[PDB]
PDB file of C-alpha atoms (C1' of nucleotides) in Angstrom:
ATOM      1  CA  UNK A 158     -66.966 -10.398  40.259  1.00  0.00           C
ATOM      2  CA  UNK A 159     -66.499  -6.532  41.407  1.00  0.00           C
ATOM      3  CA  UNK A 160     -68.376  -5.774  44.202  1.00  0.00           C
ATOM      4  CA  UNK A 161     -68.221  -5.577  47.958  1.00  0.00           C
ATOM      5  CA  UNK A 162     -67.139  -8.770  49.619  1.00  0.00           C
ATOM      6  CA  UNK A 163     -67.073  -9.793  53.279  1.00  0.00           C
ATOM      7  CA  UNK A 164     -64.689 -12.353  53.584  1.00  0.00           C
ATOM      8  CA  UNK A 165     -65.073 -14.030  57.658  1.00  0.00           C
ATOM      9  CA  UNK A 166     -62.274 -15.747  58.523  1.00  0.00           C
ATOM     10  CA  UNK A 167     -62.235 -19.277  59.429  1.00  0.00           C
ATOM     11  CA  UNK A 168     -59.789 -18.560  62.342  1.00  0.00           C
ATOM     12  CA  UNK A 169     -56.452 -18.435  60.705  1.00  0.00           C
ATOM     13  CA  UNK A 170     -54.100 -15.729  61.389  1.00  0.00           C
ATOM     14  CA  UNK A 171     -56.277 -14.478  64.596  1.00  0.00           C
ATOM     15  CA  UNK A 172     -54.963 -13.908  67.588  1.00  0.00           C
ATOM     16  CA  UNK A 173     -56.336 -17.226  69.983  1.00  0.00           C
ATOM     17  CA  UNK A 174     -59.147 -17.785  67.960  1.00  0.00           C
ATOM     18  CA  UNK A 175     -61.081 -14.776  67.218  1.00  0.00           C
ATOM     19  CA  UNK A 176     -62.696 -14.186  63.437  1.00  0.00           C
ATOM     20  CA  UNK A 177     -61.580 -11.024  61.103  1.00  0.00           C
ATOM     21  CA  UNK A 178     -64.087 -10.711  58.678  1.00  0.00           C
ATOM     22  CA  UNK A 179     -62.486  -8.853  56.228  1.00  0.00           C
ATOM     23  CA  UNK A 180     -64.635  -6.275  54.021  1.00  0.00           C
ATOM     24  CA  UNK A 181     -63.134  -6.011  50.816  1.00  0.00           C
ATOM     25  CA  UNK A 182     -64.120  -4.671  47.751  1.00  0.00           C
ATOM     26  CA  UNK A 183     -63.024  -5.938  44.587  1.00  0.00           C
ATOM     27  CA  UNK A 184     -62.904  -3.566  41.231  1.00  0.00           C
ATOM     28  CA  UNK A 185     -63.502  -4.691  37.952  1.00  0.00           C
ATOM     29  CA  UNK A 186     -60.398  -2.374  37.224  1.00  0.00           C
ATOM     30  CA  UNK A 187     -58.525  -0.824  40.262  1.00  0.00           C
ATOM     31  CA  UNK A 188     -56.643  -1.315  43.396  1.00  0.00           C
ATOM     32  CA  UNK A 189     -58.584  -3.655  45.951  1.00  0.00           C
ATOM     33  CA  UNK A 190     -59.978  -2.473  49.022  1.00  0.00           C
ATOM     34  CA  UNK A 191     -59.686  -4.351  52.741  1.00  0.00           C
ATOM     35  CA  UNK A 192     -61.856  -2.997  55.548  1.00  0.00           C
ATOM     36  CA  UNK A 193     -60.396  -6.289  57.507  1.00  0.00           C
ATOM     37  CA  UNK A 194     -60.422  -6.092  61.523  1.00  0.00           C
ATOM     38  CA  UNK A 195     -57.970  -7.227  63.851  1.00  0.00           C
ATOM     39  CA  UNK A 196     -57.723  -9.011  67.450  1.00  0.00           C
ATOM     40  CA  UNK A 197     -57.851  -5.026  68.799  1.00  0.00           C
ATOM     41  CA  UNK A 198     -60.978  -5.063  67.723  1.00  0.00           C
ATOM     42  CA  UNK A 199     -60.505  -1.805  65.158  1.00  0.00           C
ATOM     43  CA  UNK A 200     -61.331  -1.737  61.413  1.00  0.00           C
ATOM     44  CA  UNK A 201     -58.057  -1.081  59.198  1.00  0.00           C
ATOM     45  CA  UNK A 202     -58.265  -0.204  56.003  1.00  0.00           C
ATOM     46  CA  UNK A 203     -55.959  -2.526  53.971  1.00  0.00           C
ATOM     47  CA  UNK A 204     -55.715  -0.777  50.828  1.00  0.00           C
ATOM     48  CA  UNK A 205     -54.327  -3.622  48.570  1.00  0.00           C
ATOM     49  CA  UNK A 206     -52.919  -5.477  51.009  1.00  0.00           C
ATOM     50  CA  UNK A 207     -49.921  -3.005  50.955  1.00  0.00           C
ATOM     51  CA  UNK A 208     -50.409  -1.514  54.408  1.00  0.00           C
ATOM     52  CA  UNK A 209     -53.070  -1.628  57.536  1.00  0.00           C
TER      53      UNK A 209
ATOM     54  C1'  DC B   1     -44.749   6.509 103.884  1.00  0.00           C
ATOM     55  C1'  DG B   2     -47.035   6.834  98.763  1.00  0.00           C
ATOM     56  C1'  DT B   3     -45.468   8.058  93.812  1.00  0.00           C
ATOM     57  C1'  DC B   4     -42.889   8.925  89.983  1.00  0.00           C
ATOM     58  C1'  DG B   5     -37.659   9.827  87.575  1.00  0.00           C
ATOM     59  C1'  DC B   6     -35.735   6.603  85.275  1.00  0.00           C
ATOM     60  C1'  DG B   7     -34.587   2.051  83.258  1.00  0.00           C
ATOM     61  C1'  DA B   8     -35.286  -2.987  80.901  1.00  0.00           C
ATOM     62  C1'  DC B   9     -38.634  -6.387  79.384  1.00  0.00           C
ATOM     63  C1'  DT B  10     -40.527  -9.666  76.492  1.00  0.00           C
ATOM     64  C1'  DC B  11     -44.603  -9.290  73.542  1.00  0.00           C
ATOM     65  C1'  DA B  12     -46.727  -7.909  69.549  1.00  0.00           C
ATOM     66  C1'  DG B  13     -45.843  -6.095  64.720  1.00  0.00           C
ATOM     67  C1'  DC B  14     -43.671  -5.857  60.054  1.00  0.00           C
ATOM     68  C1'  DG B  15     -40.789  -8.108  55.961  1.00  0.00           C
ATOM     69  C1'  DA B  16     -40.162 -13.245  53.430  1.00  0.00           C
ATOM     70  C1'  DC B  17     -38.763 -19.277  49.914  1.00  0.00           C
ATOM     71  C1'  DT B  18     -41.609 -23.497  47.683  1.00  0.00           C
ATOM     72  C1'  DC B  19     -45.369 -25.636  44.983  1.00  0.00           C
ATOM     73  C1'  DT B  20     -43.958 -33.584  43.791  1.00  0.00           C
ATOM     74  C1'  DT B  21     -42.047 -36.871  40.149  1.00  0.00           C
ATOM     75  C1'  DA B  22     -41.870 -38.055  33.748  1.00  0.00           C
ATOM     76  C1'  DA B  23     -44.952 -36.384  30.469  1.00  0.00           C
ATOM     77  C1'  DT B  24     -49.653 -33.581  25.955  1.00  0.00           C
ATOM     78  C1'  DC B  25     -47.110 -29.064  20.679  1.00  0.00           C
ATOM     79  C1'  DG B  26     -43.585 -24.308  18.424  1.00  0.00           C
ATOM     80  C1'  DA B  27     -43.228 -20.031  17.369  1.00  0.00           C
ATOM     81  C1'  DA B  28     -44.983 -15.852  19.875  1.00  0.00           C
ATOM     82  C1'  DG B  29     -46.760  -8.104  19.968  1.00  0.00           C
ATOM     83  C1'  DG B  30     -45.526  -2.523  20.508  1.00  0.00           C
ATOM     84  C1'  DT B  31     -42.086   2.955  19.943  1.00  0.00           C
ATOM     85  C1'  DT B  32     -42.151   6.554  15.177  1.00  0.00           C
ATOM     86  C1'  DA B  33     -38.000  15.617  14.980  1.00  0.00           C
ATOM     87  C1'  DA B  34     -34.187  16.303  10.547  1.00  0.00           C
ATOM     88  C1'  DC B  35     -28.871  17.048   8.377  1.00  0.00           C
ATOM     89  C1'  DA B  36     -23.659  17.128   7.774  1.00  0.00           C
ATOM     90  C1'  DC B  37     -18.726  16.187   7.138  1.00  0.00           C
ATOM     91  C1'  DG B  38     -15.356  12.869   8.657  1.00  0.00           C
ATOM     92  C1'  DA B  39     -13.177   8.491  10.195  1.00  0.00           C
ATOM     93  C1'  DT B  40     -14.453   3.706   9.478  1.00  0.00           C
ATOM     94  C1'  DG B  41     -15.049  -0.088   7.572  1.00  0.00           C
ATOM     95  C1'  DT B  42     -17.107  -3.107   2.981  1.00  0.00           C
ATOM     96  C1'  DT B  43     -16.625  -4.956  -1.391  1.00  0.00           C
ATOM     97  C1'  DT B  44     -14.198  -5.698  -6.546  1.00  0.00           C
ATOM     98  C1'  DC B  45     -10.240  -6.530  -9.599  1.00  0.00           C
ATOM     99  C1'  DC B  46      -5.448  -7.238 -10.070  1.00  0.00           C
ATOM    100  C1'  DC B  47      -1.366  -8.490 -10.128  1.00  0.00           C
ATOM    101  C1'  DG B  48       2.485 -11.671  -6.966  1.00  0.00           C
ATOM    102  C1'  DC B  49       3.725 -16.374  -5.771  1.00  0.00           C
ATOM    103  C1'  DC B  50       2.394 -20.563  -5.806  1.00  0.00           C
ATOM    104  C1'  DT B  51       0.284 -23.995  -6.236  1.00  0.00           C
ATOM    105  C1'  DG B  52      -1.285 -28.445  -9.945  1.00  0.00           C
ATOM    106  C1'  DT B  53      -2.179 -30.258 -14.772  1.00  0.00           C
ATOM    107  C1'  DC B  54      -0.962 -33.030 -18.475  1.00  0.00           C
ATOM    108  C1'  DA B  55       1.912 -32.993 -22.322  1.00  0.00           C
ATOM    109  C1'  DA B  56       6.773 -33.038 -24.973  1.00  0.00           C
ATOM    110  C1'  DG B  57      11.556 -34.852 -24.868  1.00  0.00           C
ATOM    111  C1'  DG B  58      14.947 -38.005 -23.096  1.00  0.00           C
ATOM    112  C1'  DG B  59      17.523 -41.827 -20.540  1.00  0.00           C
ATOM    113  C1'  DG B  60      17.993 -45.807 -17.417  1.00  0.00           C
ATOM    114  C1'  DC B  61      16.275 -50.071 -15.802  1.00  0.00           C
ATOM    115  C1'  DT B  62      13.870 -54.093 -16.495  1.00  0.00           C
ATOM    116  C1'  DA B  63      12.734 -57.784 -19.252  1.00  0.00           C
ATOM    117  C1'  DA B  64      11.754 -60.744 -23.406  1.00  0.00           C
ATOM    118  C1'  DG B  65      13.235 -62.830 -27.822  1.00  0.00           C
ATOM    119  C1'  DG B  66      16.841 -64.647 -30.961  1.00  0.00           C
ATOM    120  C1'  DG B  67      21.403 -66.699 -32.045  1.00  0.00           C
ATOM    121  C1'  DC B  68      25.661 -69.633 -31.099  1.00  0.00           C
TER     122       DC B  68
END
DNA sequence: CGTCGCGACTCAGCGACTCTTAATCGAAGGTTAACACGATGTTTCCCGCCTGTCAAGGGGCTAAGGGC
């Protein structure tokens, strides 16, 4: 469904064994959004998954 | 007697091939300037050569009947 999602990781691709919870907003029609963190601790915006 | 001028260093990071093994039924939707000679094939009959009938004629071979 479109709409802001907040997707916490269960561990997986983390750096020991740290979380990610990756804010991502899916459009009905559009290119996807990925506010997803990273074991820096910094919020990268993931546009599509294309870059970070 | 300190650092920094100047060097590697391994750490991260980024890309990327497969989804068993037989099977349940066959195809599958759009894109919308106009015209002109020329050289280039396409398609029909038309005679040329030749092929394939059956027949006609005949003879030559084979065989069957009659006579001494």
């Amino acid at each position: 469904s479109p709409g802001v999602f907040f997707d916490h990781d269960k561990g997986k691709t983390h750096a020991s064994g740290k979380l990610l919870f990756a804010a991502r907003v899916i459009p009905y029609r559009g290119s996807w959004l990925d506010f997803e963190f990273d074991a820096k601790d910094i919020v990268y915006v993931r546009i599509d998954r294309r870059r970070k």
